[PDB]
Amino acid sequence: RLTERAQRVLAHAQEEAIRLNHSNIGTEHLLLGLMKEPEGIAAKVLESFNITEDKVIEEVEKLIGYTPRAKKVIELSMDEARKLHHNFVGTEHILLGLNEGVAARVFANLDLNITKARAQVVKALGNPEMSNKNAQASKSNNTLDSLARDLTVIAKDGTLDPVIGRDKEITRVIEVLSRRTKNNPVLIGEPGVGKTAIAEGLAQAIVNNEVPETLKDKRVMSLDMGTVGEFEERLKKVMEEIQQAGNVILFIDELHTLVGAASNILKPALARGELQCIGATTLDEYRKNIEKDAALERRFQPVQVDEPSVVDTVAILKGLRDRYEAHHRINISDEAIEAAVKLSNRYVSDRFLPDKAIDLIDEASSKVRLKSHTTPNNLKEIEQEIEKVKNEKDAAVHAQEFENAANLRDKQTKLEKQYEEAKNEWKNAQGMSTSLSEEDIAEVIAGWTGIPLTKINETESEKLLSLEDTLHERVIGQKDAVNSISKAVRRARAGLKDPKRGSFIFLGPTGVGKTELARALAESMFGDDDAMIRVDMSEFMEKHAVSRLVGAPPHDDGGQLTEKVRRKPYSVILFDEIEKAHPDVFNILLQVLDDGHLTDTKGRTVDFRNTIIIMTSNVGAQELQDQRGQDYETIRKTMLKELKNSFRPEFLNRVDDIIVFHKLTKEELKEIVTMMVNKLTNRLSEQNINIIVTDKAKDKIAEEGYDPEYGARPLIRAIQKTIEDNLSELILDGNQIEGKKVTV
């Protein structure tokens, strides 16, 4: 039938009949629709000559204080289709149909059909705009108080200060009011980290008035969420007032309203279908609270960026790099910014990097600022010079010294003699200036984590360089397999695997570097081995696939490890004896191997690629006859086949690498025992005691305990069994201690 040009406002002038509830649908539905709001859309050009638009609004709005007269206005409006050389009829020739639509009284809003309206048709384009670019009928074309306090005017002071970077984000925010659905995005995750300062980005657009054509009217107010007998009847009061005033928005500041003094206070007024504002909730509180309603989970749009990304933080950081510089009184060599984002990026597994890196602006800036806080030892030596006798200088006044005389003015002259030097070298020595990286990185995370080693130094031009080397220092051997890994998930790093996507097999007996270099492995990785978690795949069989996958058909025995790592922000996993099982289970252990995570039943989808899992085998004592010195390719290919006997390439094509044991010898026995000596060097020679290494006893007992069954691990205890008891010898000595050395 009709078009988009202001039949828009006749469909919603039929909503103006629903708005204004009148038994004659009046021209003030056409015009109090056509004037959508009391804003100056006065932009109708006829407030020049005779009749004010706002005067029409007031007097016809007192007349209320298609109605076939105005259904003939539909006709006379369609009569204007050929009168002014058009295709179609536009937006204000409704009013050029509005003979009847006048407030014709003593103050008549009688409407000029010609008078200077023809000069106003020399004004309006007319025959250029027939219709339809999509439809080109746009805008200017041819208690009310501290209960809702704001920051909008406070930003419009300029006192609130510009954060930067969220152009697309605040753009999204603009798009949310373009919904017909969900007028807030509940920013989830870590809100208010700067996401409150994203709202400062929004009021920042208000003070800019980059805030558009339309949205300059309504404004952000800050809610008062505090306590009073009843708290809430006042709030129900102020609801109808400012909601009736209706030219603002507010926040839920922190909490969705689930309280006792009540929860459903004006949550029914929300449920009245009204009231565009902003809520507040997090990731799992979207998942709890907002989803706990599932009408909250209906009504708002969940959006976040986190406690955020990289160059976002570079943006807002180098933008606020003047503001918080007016706080912390230092300013930046931006390599500190680089290394800061870089390192707390590498670190913080449970909290997030960047508002914690704003907190690094706090810690590091507070650190240089605390070589920069209080009165400035040699200036304090000058203060000792200020600090010999005023605090006892004087009393010769009290009685008859002929002596007041001397020592009085001796120390008058003598101090003031020795004084203004303090001013001179003090104002000189009141340090260097900008916030350098090196030590306001190194010193400060040394104030947090430490050692400018694995905990700080760690540029991976260092450890990726000496990587294979470094772990090969720990448990020697398998260096082929070592940089088969260090190579292998070297190219997990530099992004060349999937960002959510690694498994490594053992070939030997336990604790030969299985326990010990799976140990020393993760202890090299992030400096600490504690991440790594065990199930044998002799253990995960059928209903440890139940206690691996939660029940309801067969209990909450699901996950021997699930709820732990579910709570954890970081872990590493090692599993054992894989083709001790059959090709059937390798699909559920392959379900561990999936997803860029695992799907068990309990809690959360996250990354894989930050750390590693590891596999282990021991069965191939048969192919040790192959070792009894055939190659990597021979025996790895042999138990790559014998591997593949039970295995699945879905499952195996989630495993990275076959990892050998170069079974070990008595020599590697001797040398990991030599590492055990270097342990006691590393711990108990910290009393810095010298060491007799008697190779009689060493190769004696080493010769003894080279276990065919157990390998090396238990013997280590069986070393110390005597040996550290031998230390007790030494402990009960206190004599062959630091600097000296005995054994047999």
XYZ file of C-alpha atoms in Angstrom:
744
model
C 0.000 0.000 0.000
C 1.898 2.890 1.487
C 5.530 4.008 1.961
C 8.166 4.344 4.717
C 8.104 8.142 4.655
C 6.028 9.168 7.707
C 3.493 6.364 7.337
C 6.105 5.263 9.782
C 4.685 8.088 11.867
C 1.099 7.246 10.872
C 1.520 3.649 12.020
C 3.026 5.187 15.126
C 0.377 7.910 15.038
C -1.960 4.961 15.423
C 0.398 4.240 18.314
C -0.151 7.900 19.307
C -3.824 7.021 19.551
C -2.689 4.229 21.875
C -0.321 6.745 23.512
C -2.925 9.428 24.043
C -6.092 7.265 24.459
C -8.534 9.569 22.673
C -12.077 8.825 21.455
C -11.407 10.934 18.376
C -8.017 10.080 16.863
C -6.800 13.623 16.452
C -4.303 15.534 14.344
C -2.133 15.669 17.486
C -1.589 11.980 16.873
C -0.370 12.888 13.392
C 1.479 15.901 14.791
C 2.338 14.776 18.322
C 3.612 11.779 16.446
C 5.119 13.948 13.704
C 6.661 15.980 16.457
C 7.921 12.762 18.074
C 9.022 14.474 21.267
C 9.184 18.115 22.528
C 12.587 18.512 20.814
C 12.973 21.104 18.073
C 12.168 18.795 15.127
C 10.642 23.530 15.469
C 12.789 22.305 12.550
C 9.613 22.503 10.504
C 10.289 25.671 8.575
C 6.984 27.454 9.284
C 8.087 28.911 12.631
C 9.512 31.739 10.509
C 6.374 33.606 9.367
C 3.108 33.045 11.211
C 2.632 30.063 13.508
C 5.036 28.455 15.976
C 5.174 24.656 15.811
C 5.433 24.518 19.584
C 2.377 26.782 19.770
C 0.508 24.218 17.680
C 1.717 21.500 20.070
C 0.424 23.357 23.120
C -2.965 24.489 21.823
C -3.956 21.269 20.075
C -2.560 19.452 23.104
C -5.120 21.504 24.982
C -7.680 20.401 22.410
C -6.893 16.872 23.588
C -6.966 18.279 27.123
C -8.932 8.739 11.188
C -11.582 11.318 12.429
C -12.989 11.809 8.929
C -11.969 15.452 8.762
C -8.403 14.126 8.952
C -9.212 11.171 6.707
C -9.940 13.810 4.081
C -6.461 15.101 4.965
C -5.196 11.746 3.651
C -6.986 12.634 0.402
C -5.824 16.262 0.166
C -2.341 14.993 0.994
C -2.647 12.601 -1.932
C -4.010 15.553 -3.910
C -0.576 17.131 -3.337
C 1.022 14.254 -5.283
C 0.631 16.044 -8.619
C 0.282 19.652 -7.428
C 3.997 20.058 -6.757
C 5.505 17.757 -9.475
C 6.282 14.641 -7.436
C 6.164 10.917 -7.606
C 4.984 10.461 -4.050
C 3.911 12.259 -0.865
C 6.410 13.011 1.917
C 6.482 13.837 5.623
C 4.998 17.340 6.211
C 2.349 17.564 3.474
C 0.199 15.881 6.103
C 0.341 19.324 7.707
C -0.171 20.907 4.276
C -3.338 18.836 4.402
C -3.895 20.210 7.916
C -7.952 23.444 6.719
C -8.977 21.275 9.683
C -5.717 20.620 11.521
C -5.498 24.115 12.995
C -5.904 25.399 16.527
C -8.109 28.132 15.069
C -9.027 30.269 18.104
C -8.309 33.784 19.398
C -4.671 32.716 19.196
C -5.318 30.842 15.941
C -2.746 28.335 14.721
C -4.290 28.774 11.280
C -1.977 27.285 8.708
C -0.791 29.129 5.628
C -1.652 27.277 2.458
C 0.197 29.875 0.351
C 1.059 33.019 2.246
C 4.821 32.694 2.363
C 4.646 28.906 2.290
C 5.374 29.175 -1.443
C 8.631 30.908 -0.528
C 9.068 27.962 1.840
C 8.583 25.724 -1.247
C 11.330 27.716 -2.921
C 13.116 26.621 0.291
C 12.298 22.872 0.229
C 13.828 20.702 -2.553
C 10.511 19.032 -3.443
C 10.831 17.407 -6.877
C 14.391 16.203 -6.111
C 13.025 14.037 -3.262
C 10.363 11.895 -4.884
C 11.082 9.104 -2.370
C 13.231 6.107 -1.568
C 16.932 6.087 -1.205
C 15.669 3.485 1.148
C 13.279 6.203 2.047
C 14.834 9.630 2.296
C 12.539 11.473 4.696
C 14.965 12.086 7.523
C 15.173 14.731 10.238
C 16.209 18.223 8.968
C 15.508 17.462 5.337
C 14.557 19.652 2.506
C 12.575 14.643 42.266
C 15.031 14.829 39.378
C 18.058 14.904 41.652
C 21.058 13.179 43.306
C 19.074 9.992 43.958
C 20.007 9.710 40.347
C 23.254 11.660 40.550
C 25.250 11.703 37.363
C 28.671 11.894 35.944
C 27.368 13.085 32.559
C 27.655 16.736 33.498
C 30.754 15.817 35.488
C 32.244 14.469 32.302
C 30.827 17.571 30.648
C 32.894 19.534 33.082
C 35.907 17.885 31.478
C 36.915 16.894 35.015
C 36.293 13.308 34.062
C 39.000 12.524 31.723
C 39.297 10.728 28.377
C 40.053 7.037 28.177
C 40.431 5.906 24.566
C 40.262 2.937 22.197
C 36.682 1.682 22.486
C 35.415 3.223 19.222
C 34.035 -0.059 17.969
C 32.908 -0.908 21.487
C 31.053 2.330 22.166
C 29.860 1.979 18.604
C 28.341 -1.363 19.690
C 26.843 0.517 22.609
C 25.187 2.922 20.170
C 23.902 -0.111 18.302
C 22.272 -1.481 21.447
C 19.882 1.444 21.654
C 19.181 0.696 18.002
C 17.652 -2.599 19.122
C 14.043 -3.358 19.558
C 15.110 -5.925 22.091
C 17.732 -5.547 24.831
C 18.705 -1.950 25.593
C 21.708 -2.662 27.824
C 24.505 -4.954 26.947
C 25.355 -6.503 30.263
C 29.096 -6.214 30.048
C 30.218 -9.381 31.708
C 33.468 -10.844 32.907
C 35.404 -8.263 34.726
C 33.177 -5.171 34.428
C 34.155 -1.825 35.781
C 37.846 -2.426 35.106
C 37.752 0.353 32.715
C 34.305 -0.762 31.617
C 32.916 1.717 33.983
C 35.514 3.768 32.142
C 33.933 2.520 28.920
C 30.839 4.283 30.234
C 33.265 7.167 30.724
C 33.918 6.609 27.039
C 30.217 7.112 26.523
C 29.868 10.249 28.626
C 33.163 11.143 26.977
C 31.233 11.066 23.743
C 28.555 13.170 25.462
C 30.978 15.954 26.443
C 32.353 15.624 22.936
C 28.719 15.598 21.736
C 29.989 13.102 19.239
C 26.940 11.560 20.840
C 24.678 12.102 17.885
C 21.840 14.100 16.489
C 19.354 12.065 18.465
C 20.988 10.755 21.623
C 22.145 14.133 22.904
C 18.841 14.382 24.774
C 18.876 11.568 27.310
C 21.863 11.109 29.576
C 23.676 8.766 31.924
C 22.949 9.192 35.590
C 24.669 7.283 38.404
C 22.430 5.345 40.746
C 22.382 5.739 44.494
C 22.503 2.160 45.791
C 22.629 2.607 49.572
C 20.542 2.090 52.715
C 17.913 4.035 54.683
C 13.527 2.214 57.839
C 12.305 1.146 54.440
C 14.690 1.795 51.600
C 12.506 1.236 48.678
C 9.197 3.112 48.768
C 11.279 6.248 48.155
C 12.721 4.494 45.149
C 9.278 3.503 43.888
C 8.456 7.166 44.461
C 11.365 8.582 42.481
C 10.691 6.037 39.713
C 7.467 7.621 38.551
C 8.915 11.110 38.895
C 12.025 10.918 36.802
C 10.601 8.134 34.658
C 7.823 10.612 34.066
C 10.534 13.206 33.462
C 12.076 10.537 31.195
C 15.105 12.202 29.616
C 17.893 10.297 31.382
C 19.292 6.818 31.811
C 20.903 5.165 34.811
C 22.986 2.195 35.863
C 22.601 -0.769 37.898
C 25.892 0.121 39.441
C 26.992 -3.233 40.808
C 24.177 -5.569 41.605
C 21.093 -6.870 39.974
C 18.498 -6.186 42.643
C 18.203 -9.324 44.726
C 17.887 -7.867 48.231
C 15.489 -7.832 51.149
C 14.990 -4.114 51.690
C 12.999 -6.018 48.441
C 14.402 -7.613 45.319
C 11.321 -6.880 43.180
C 11.377 -3.154 43.817
C 10.846 -1.631 40.343
C 11.952 -4.842 38.755
C 8.175 -4.942 38.280
C 8.576 -1.430 36.823
C 11.233 -2.881 34.567
C 8.630 -5.569 33.926
C 6.168 -2.792 33.056
C 7.951 -2.713 29.709
C 9.693 0.620 30.158
C 12.814 2.192 31.329
C 15.989 1.837 29.222
C 19.051 1.674 31.472
C 22.111 -0.433 32.189
C 22.663 -3.449 34.428
C 25.780 -5.035 35.885
C 26.814 -8.701 36.135
C 29.800 -10.920 35.268
C 30.445 -14.009 33.124
C 29.291 -16.633 35.556
C 26.864 -14.105 37.032
C 25.320 -13.713 33.676
C 25.395 -17.490 33.958
C 24.085 -17.261 37.456
C 22.030 -14.237 38.215
C 20.842 -13.104 34.829
C 20.308 -16.688 33.735
C 18.893 -17.465 37.200
C 15.990 -15.250 36.273
C 15.837 -16.279 32.587
C 13.833 -13.071 32.229
C 16.894 -11.081 33.042
C 18.601 -13.516 30.640
C 15.882 -12.495 28.265
C 15.819 -8.795 28.677
C 19.471 -7.596 28.336
C 22.155 -8.199 25.717
C 25.281 -9.880 27.128
C 28.389 -8.203 25.735
C 31.921 -7.966 26.964
C 35.454 -7.469 26.337
C 37.246 -8.647 29.464
C 39.450 -6.964 31.774
C 40.823 -6.613 28.234
C 42.915 -6.933 24.396
C 46.467 -5.935 23.592
C 46.543 -2.783 21.509
C 43.271 -1.862 23.162
C 45.260 -1.624 26.374
C 48.035 0.161 24.496
C 45.396 2.610 23.308
C 43.675 3.390 26.623
C 47.052 3.247 28.347
C 48.780 5.731 26.119
C 45.594 7.809 26.225
C 45.403 7.860 30.023
C 49.196 8.276 29.933
C 48.676 11.901 30.910
C 45.858 11.563 33.472
C 47.382 9.032 35.774
C 50.646 10.778 35.095
C 49.030 13.678 36.825
C 48.526 11.217 39.642
C 51.801 9.238 39.972
C 53.993 12.215 39.043
C 56.216 10.243 36.649
C 55.861 9.535 32.876
C 56.796 6.732 30.607
C 59.525 5.226 28.574
C 56.986 3.077 26.785
C 59.141 -0.039 26.701
C 57.904 -0.345 30.264
C 54.427 -0.445 28.718
C 55.601 -3.108 26.262
C 57.264 -5.320 28.842
C 54.479 -4.711 31.351
C 51.625 -5.833 29.097
C 54.032 -8.505 27.899
C 54.878 -9.997 31.273
C 51.593 -9.812 33.142
C 50.250 -11.150 29.882
C 52.587 -14.105 30.405
C 51.551 -14.386 34.012
C 48.161 -13.865 35.382
C 46.184 -17.032 34.888
C 43.255 -16.457 37.222
C 42.898 -12.686 37.267
C 43.409 -10.820 34.021
C 46.408 -8.868 32.747
C 45.450 -5.263 31.980
C 43.639 -3.543 34.847
C 46.181 -5.508 36.810
C 48.630 -3.772 34.445
C 46.923 -0.542 35.324
C 47.778 -1.877 38.744
C 51.283 -2.217 37.352
C 51.038 1.471 36.672
C 50.155 1.572 40.346
C 53.015 -0.658 41.507
C 55.793 0.426 39.181
C 54.715 4.047 39.128
C 54.434 3.849 42.870
C 57.892 2.321 42.877
C 59.721 5.096 41.054
C 57.348 7.350 42.947
C 58.892 5.638 45.944
C 62.200 6.648 45.018
C 60.188 9.825 44.841
C 57.967 10.214 47.948
C 59.256 11.829 51.114
C 62.156 14.068 52.242
C 65.399 13.208 50.295
C 71.867 9.699 53.346
C 74.290 12.429 52.411
C 71.531 14.974 52.294
C 70.532 13.262 55.526
C 74.155 13.776 56.589
C 73.513 17.438 55.838
C 70.457 16.972 58.026
C 72.724 15.592 60.767
C 74.521 18.870 60.272
C 71.080 20.464 60.756
C 70.889 17.810 63.573
C 73.558 18.338 66.396
C 72.349 21.148 69.006
C 69.047 23.247 68.290
C 67.077 20.580 70.131
C 69.462 21.466 72.861
C 70.908 24.907 72.029
C 69.448 27.581 74.151
C 68.861 27.660 77.855
C 71.655 30.111 78.809
C 68.829 32.661 78.662
C 67.239 31.042 81.772
C 69.646 32.573 84.277
C 72.911 34.439 84.589
C 75.304 33.229 81.964
C 77.881 35.702 80.993
C 79.155 32.651 79.091
C 73.704 33.813 77.436
C 76.550 34.920 75.594
C 78.863 32.739 73.558
C 77.594 29.228 72.832
C 74.241 30.763 72.095
C 75.624 32.891 69.314
C 78.390 30.402 68.585
C 75.719 27.999 67.390
C 73.606 30.755 65.881
C 76.545 31.713 63.688
C 77.683 28.126 63.525
C 74.456 26.656 62.277
C 73.464 29.515 59.945
C 77.039 29.222 58.822
C 76.283 25.572 58.187
C 72.766 25.878 56.872
C 71.861 27.188 53.419
C 74.022 24.502 51.862
C 71.076 22.222 52.752
C 68.891 24.358 50.504
C 71.491 24.435 47.753
C 72.418 20.793 47.332
C 68.972 19.825 48.413
C 67.237 21.632 45.562
C 69.871 20.044 43.376
C 69.300 16.596 44.829
C 65.549 16.711 45.623
C 66.733 11.667 40.333
C 66.226 10.741 36.680
C 62.920 11.286 35.249
C 60.950 9.136 32.889
C 59.603 5.678 33.599
C 62.226 3.432 32.093
C 61.537 -0.182 31.278
C 64.540 -2.206 32.453
C 64.333 -1.826 36.184
C 60.894 -0.403 36.585
C 60.054 -3.666 34.909
C 62.804 -5.778 36.475
C 62.797 -4.159 39.919
C 59.024 -4.063 40.142
C 58.088 -7.568 39.064
C 61.097 -8.396 41.154
C 58.827 -6.748 43.683
C 56.229 -9.248 42.581
C 57.646 -12.480 41.179
C 61.392 -12.075 41.115
C 64.890 -12.799 39.769
C 65.908 -10.574 36.929
C 65.273 -15.852 35.718
C 62.611 -18.242 34.650
C 60.497 -15.859 36.706
C 61.686 -12.634 35.041
C 64.641 -12.799 32.626
C 62.958 -15.152 30.238
C 62.681 -13.330 26.904
C 62.552 -16.598 24.863
C 65.331 -15.251 22.757
C 66.937 -16.810 25.788
C 64.988 -19.936 26.625
C 63.762 -20.903 23.165
C 67.405 -20.477 22.269
C 68.779 -22.582 25.115
C 65.627 -24.602 25.514
C 66.515 -28.181 24.560
C 69.821 -27.421 26.230
C 68.184 -26.234 29.466
C 65.879 -29.197 29.979
C 68.647 -31.479 28.821
C 70.613 -30.148 31.810
C 67.924 -31.587 34.051
C 67.640 -35.255 33.166
C 70.191 -36.068 30.523
C 69.307 -38.172 27.510
C 66.516 -38.262 24.927
C 67.701 -34.977 23.496
C 66.346 -36.050 20.128
C 62.970 -36.408 21.819
C 63.671 -33.243 23.838
C 63.834 -30.867 20.911
C 61.394 -33.095 19.187
C 59.156 -31.492 21.770
C 60.949 -28.136 22.073
C 60.859 -28.045 18.303
C 57.373 -29.574 18.201
C 55.520 -27.185 20.426
C 58.086 -24.611 19.591
C 55.771 -24.272 16.620
C 52.802 -24.336 18.826
C 54.421 -21.041 19.755
C 54.669 -18.378 17.083
C 51.010 -19.381 16.553
C 51.603 -22.114 14.001
C 49.259 -24.554 15.660
C 45.584 -23.881 16.377
C 44.961 -21.327 19.172
C 42.903 -23.976 20.918
C 44.655 -27.221 20.179
C 49.483 -31.456 22.487
C 50.532 -34.905 23.782
C 53.868 -36.629 24.277
C 54.581 -40.297 24.944
C 57.145 -42.028 27.210
C 59.155 -45.161 26.378
C 60.609 -46.689 29.536
C 60.170 -47.506 33.238
C 58.761 -45.074 35.805
C 60.701 -42.333 37.487
C 63.699 -42.413 35.160
C 62.849 -39.009 33.974
C 59.253 -40.089 33.730
C 58.423 -38.761 37.156
C 61.698 -36.929 37.239
C 61.858 -35.059 33.929
C 58.142 -34.869 33.564
C 58.824 -33.165 36.880
C 61.872 -31.171 35.746
C 60.022 -30.568 32.466
C 57.224 -28.474 33.894
C 59.624 -27.084 36.477
C 61.463 -25.551 33.555
C 58.328 -24.361 31.730
C 56.961 -21.658 33.941
C 59.571 -22.174 36.648
C 57.444 -24.682 38.525
C 56.385 -28.313 38.074
C 53.283 -28.334 40.239
C 50.793 -28.082 37.370
C 50.842 -31.677 36.230
C 48.114 -34.181 37.051
C 47.980 -37.948 36.831
C 45.645 -40.708 35.791
C 46.999 -44.040 34.542
C 45.202 -45.367 31.493
C 45.378 -48.664 33.257
C 43.075 -46.736 35.625
C 40.692 -45.071 33.138
C 39.015 -48.193 31.826
C 35.212 -48.532 31.920
C 33.809 -46.888 35.023
C 36.717 -44.728 35.516
C 35.226 -43.561 32.274
C 32.356 -43.067 34.697
C 34.689 -41.471 37.230
C 36.083 -39.673 34.129
C 32.632 -38.715 32.721
C 29.845 -37.776 35.167
C 26.708 -39.942 35.373
C 22.867 -39.541 35.751
C 22.641 -42.923 34.008
C 25.727 -44.648 35.391
C 27.120 -40.713 39.583
C 29.096 -37.509 40.274
C 32.052 -39.759 40.119
C 33.037 -38.031 36.957
C 36.436 -36.646 36.594
C 39.136 -37.909 38.812
C 40.543 -34.502 37.890
C 37.543 -32.419 36.645
C 36.530 -30.193 39.523
C 40.157 -29.484 40.432
C 41.196 -28.014 37.105
C 37.715 -26.606 36.757
C 38.749 -24.557 39.768
C 42.322 -24.153 38.464
C 43.550 -21.374 36.190
C 46.615 -23.403 35.079
C 47.639 -27.072 35.000
C 49.628 -29.647 32.990
C 48.525 -33.256 32.652
C 50.490 -36.517 32.430
C 48.883 -39.892 31.686
C 50.350 -43.417 31.523
C 50.116 -46.925 29.968
C 47.906 -46.148 27.031
C 47.849 -49.345 24.947
C 47.629 -51.265 28.152
C 44.054 -50.403 27.128
C 42.282 -51.070 23.805
C 41.177 -48.902 20.814
C 37.781 -48.425 22.514
C 38.909 -46.179 25.409
C 41.180 -44.075 23.157
C 38.073 -42.218 21.996
C 37.221 -41.047 25.509
C 40.817 -40.191 26.243
C 40.593 -38.690 22.797
C 37.648 -36.709 24.193
C 40.176 -35.349 26.627
C 42.252 -34.738 23.492
C 39.615 -32.589 21.836
C 37.844 -29.298 21.678
C 40.813 -27.175 22.351
C 39.784 -28.531 25.814
C 37.945 -31.606 27.083
C 34.243 -32.079 27.312
C 33.537 -33.603 30.691
C 30.293 -32.449 32.299
C 31.462 -29.827 34.699
C 31.759 -26.140 34.246
C 33.491 -24.215 31.470
C 34.953 -24.151 27.949
C 38.449 -22.636 27.784
C 41.766 -22.808 25.933
C 44.084 -25.754 25.523
C 47.139 -24.166 24.108
C 48.678 -22.465 27.161
C 50.011 -25.810 28.486
C 50.569 -29.479 27.766
C 49.554 -33.072 28.432
C 51.945 -36.021 28.301
C 51.550 -39.777 27.735
C 53.596 -42.709 29.005
C 54.247 -46.326 28.081
C 56.302 -49.129 29.593
C 55.188 -52.276 27.777
C 57.830 -52.288 25.054
C 60.435 -54.345 26.893
C 60.203 -56.638 23.850
C 61.438 -53.916 21.515
C 64.222 -53.089 23.973
C 65.830 -56.044 22.182
C 65.606 -53.541 19.332
C 67.397 -51.228 21.762
C 69.734 -54.082 22.747
C 71.327 -50.021 19.710
C 68.979 -49.596 16.762
C 67.912 -46.162 15.691
C 65.215 -43.679 16.525
C 63.697 -44.619 13.182
C 63.917 -48.374 13.653
C 62.526 -48.636 17.148
C 60.357 -45.520 17.074
C 58.998 -46.843 13.805
C 58.660 -50.266 15.424
C 56.649 -49.112 18.408
C 55.100 -46.530 16.109
C 53.660 -49.616 14.494
C 53.179 -51.452 17.791
C 51.884 -48.124 19.044
C 49.414 -48.080 16.169
C 48.349 -51.675 16.974
C 45.902 -50.595 19.619
C 45.645 -47.025 18.533
C 43.292 -44.722 16.687
C 44.555 -41.950 14.342
C 41.758 -39.710 15.492
C 43.214 -40.267 18.948
C 46.795 -40.492 17.656
C 46.259 -37.470 15.433
C 45.654 -35.635 18.632
C 48.941 -36.964 20.056
C 52.034 -35.017 19.107
C 55.060 -37.130 19.723
C 56.625 -40.444 20.659
C 59.108 -39.666 23.431
C 61.899 -42.147 24.067
C 64.168 -43.158 26.864
C 67.705 -43.389 25.499
C 65.307 -47.755 29.397
C 68.505 -46.108 30.630
C 71.991 -47.339 31.490
C 74.176 -47.467 34.574
C 75.900 -44.405 33.147
C 72.761 -42.268 33.192
C 72.147 -43.862 36.576
C 75.526 -42.478 37.649
C 74.803 -39.106 36.121
C 71.309 -38.541 37.479
C 72.794 -39.664 40.769
C 75.334 -36.950 39.967
C 72.357 -34.627 39.595
C 71.194 -35.856 43.002
C 74.594 -34.821 44.328
C 73.985 -31.515 42.611
C 70.646 -31.383 44.390
C 72.279 -31.614 47.792
C 74.799 -29.153 46.513
C 71.821 -27.080 45.403
C 70.103 -27.297 48.797
C 72.407 -28.319 51.592
C 75.495 -26.724 50.189
C 73.645 -23.416 50.373
C 75.590 -24.614 54.151
C 78.306 -24.451 51.490
C 80.055 -27.622 52.602
C 82.668 -29.386 50.479
C 82.012 -32.878 49.123
C 83.880 -36.161 49.005
C 82.442 -38.201 46.163
C 83.759 -41.699 46.919
C 83.247 -43.617 43.685
C 83.978 -46.843 45.571
C 80.741 -46.389 47.479
C 79.050 -44.542 44.608
C 79.633 -47.041 41.831
C 79.352 -49.727 44.490
C 75.804 -48.950 45.579
C 74.950 -47.607 42.130
C 76.077 -50.965 40.739
C 73.874 -52.634 43.349
C 70.597 -50.817 42.870
C 70.418 -50.572 39.092
C 67.001 -52.161 39.125
C 65.930 -54.346 36.231
C 62.392 -54.041 37.510
C 62.213 -50.554 38.977
C 64.902 -48.700 37.120
C 66.376 -45.906 39.172
C 63.731 -43.980 41.214
C 63.457 -46.047 44.499
C 67.221 -46.476 44.723
C 67.454 -42.681 45.019
C 65.754 -43.010 48.400
C 68.013 -45.985 49.081
C 70.928 -43.659 48.422
C 69.886 -41.063 50.948
C 68.818 -43.847 53.300
C 72.438 -44.124 54.265
C 73.855 -40.982 52.782
C 71.851 -38.221 54.377
C 71.981 -40.373 57.490
C 75.695 -40.026 56.828
C 74.910 -36.292 56.828
C 73.513 -36.879 60.286
C 77.017 -38.166 61.042
C 78.127 -34.763 59.813
C 75.180 -33.132 61.605
C 76.270 -34.837 64.786
C 79.735 -33.772 63.785
C 79.494 -30.061 63.130
C 83.176 -30.653 62.370
C 83.440 -32.023 58.838
C 81.086 -29.217 57.824
C 81.450 -26.077 55.717
C 84.734 -26.155 53.862
C 85.572 -29.814 54.555
C 84.503 -33.197 53.192
C 84.350 -36.861 54.286
C 82.853 -40.185 53.433
C 84.276 -43.692 52.974
